[PDB]
C-alpha cells in the first residue's frame, strides 16, 4: 500500500484536508490507507470513509449514465453507425466504477465488518456493502446480475434487522439505510410497491419518535426524513 509508511493519524488529518479541498480521490486513498492499518474506525472516521467513496463513485455513476444514454440513442431506429467508440468509452468508465466498488467491498470484507460489534458501526458498514453492490447492480447486464442484486438485498436486509432491534427510529444511519433500501426496491429490484411501503413506514415511525430528541438531533433526523418525503412525492 502506497499509504503504508504514513501514520494513521496523518492519514486521517489529510483526509479531512482533502475533504475541505474537494479532492475526493485523495480523500478515499487516505481513508483506504487508514483502514489498512488494521484498527477499527471511530464514528467520525467512518463518515470520512463513506463520504470519500460516495463522491468518487457518485461522479463515475453520473458519467456512466451520460454515456449510457448516448449509447442507447446510438442504437435506436434511424441512428447513423458511429463505430465502437461510445461503447468502448462507456465500458472504460464502467470498468473504473466497478473497480472502486470492488475496492470498497474488499475493505468492508477485510476486515471492517467482522470486527464491527456495536450496532452503529455494523449497520453502517452493512449499509455501505448494500450501497456498493447496488452500484454494481446499476451497470450489471450479464450472467451474474441476479447474484449481484441478491448480494445487495442480503446486505441491506441484515442491516435493517439489526437497526430495527438496536437503534431508535430516528437514528440517522437507520434512516439513511431505509431510504437506500427503498431506492434499491424501486430502481434495482423492480418492486416499486415495496419501495413506497418502506419509505412511508420509515417516515411515519421516525415522525412519532421526534419528541424524544434534542434540537440538534431533531435537525439531524428531519434532513433525511425529507428525502424519504421527496421520493414518495416523486413515486406517487
Amino acid at each position: 500500500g502506497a499509504m503504508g509508511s504514513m501514520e494513521r493519524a496523518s492519514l486521517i488529518q489529510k483526509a479531512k484536508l482533502a475533504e475541505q479541498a474537494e479532492r475526493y480521490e485523495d480523500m478515499a486513498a487516505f481513508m483506504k490507507g487508514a483502514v489498512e492499518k488494521g484498527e477499527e474506525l471511530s464514528c467520525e472516521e467512518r463518515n470520512l470513509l463513506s463520504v470519500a467513496y460516495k463522491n468518487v463513485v457518485g461522479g463515475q455513476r453520473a458519467a456512466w449514465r451520460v454515456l449510457s444514454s448516448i449509447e442507447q440513442k446510438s442504437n435506436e431506429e434511424g441512428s447513423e453507425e458511429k463505430g465502437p467508440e461510445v461503447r468502448e468509452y462507456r465500458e472504460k468508465v464502467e470498468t473504473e466504477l466497478q473497480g472502486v466498488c470492488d475496492t470498497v467491498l474488499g475493505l468492508l470484507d477485510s476486515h471492517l465488518i467482522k470486527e464491527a460489534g456495536d450496532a452503529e458501526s455494523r449497520v453502517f458498514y452493512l449499509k455501505m456493502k448494500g450501497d456498493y453492490y447496488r452500484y454494481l447492480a446499476e451497470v450489471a447486464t450479464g450472467d451474474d446480475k441476479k447474484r449481484i442484486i441478491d448480494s445487495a438485498r442480503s446486505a441491506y436486509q441484515e442491516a435493517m434487522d439489526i437497526s430495527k432491534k438496536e437503534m431508535p427510529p430516528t437514528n440517522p444511519i437507520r434512516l439513511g439505510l431505509a431510504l437506500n433500501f427503498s431506492v434499491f426496491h424501486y430502481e434495482i429490484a423492480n418492486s416499486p410497491e415495496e419501495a413506497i411501503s418502506l419509505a412511508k413506514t420509515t417516515f411515519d415511525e421516525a415522525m412519532a419518535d421526534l419528541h424524544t430528541l434534542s434540537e440538534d438531533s431533531y435537525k439531524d433526523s428531519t434532513l433525511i426524513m425529507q428525502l424519504l418525503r421527496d421520493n414518495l412525492t416523486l413515486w406517487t
Binding site: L179, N180, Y186
Partner: peptide, 6 residues
C-alpha cells in the same frame, strides 16, 4: 427520475 439516496 433518479431517486434521492444517502
Amino acid at each position: 427520475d433518479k431517486a434521492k439516496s444517502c
